[PDB]
Amino acid sequence: ADNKFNKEQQNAFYEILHLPNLNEXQRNAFIXSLKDDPSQSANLLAEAKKLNDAQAPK
């Protein structure tokens, strides 16, 4: 375990960036979480996408 950020974690990073409605504060809490704890990638994606969806004008 030399690297801390696997491809999955980077994928999560890009997926969170892939969220345009996510407030830039929230995007960068999620990507704070991803980048102290590169483990809850799926959790952070779930929350970030739900919050992105919430902030997304329907």
The owner of tokens 């929350």 is 47
Contacts of 22 (CB under 8 A, 6+ apart): 16, 30, 48, 51, 52, 55
Spatial distance between the Cα atoms of 37 and 30, rounded to a whole number of angstroms: 10
What would the two tokens of residue 4 be? 């801390």
Q: Concatenated DSSP letters for 1-27? A: ---S--HHHHHHHHHHHT-SSS-HHHH
State the Cα torsion 20-50-34-5 to the nearest 10°: -80
Spatial distance between the Cα atoms of 22 and 37, rounded to a whole number of angstroms: 20
Spatial distance between the Cα atoms of 57 and 2, rounded to a whole number of angstroms: 42
Spatial distance between the Cα atoms of 19 and 11, rounded to a whole number of angstroms: 13
Determined by which method? NMR
**CATH numbers and ranges of domains, the chain:** 7-55 (1.20.5.420)
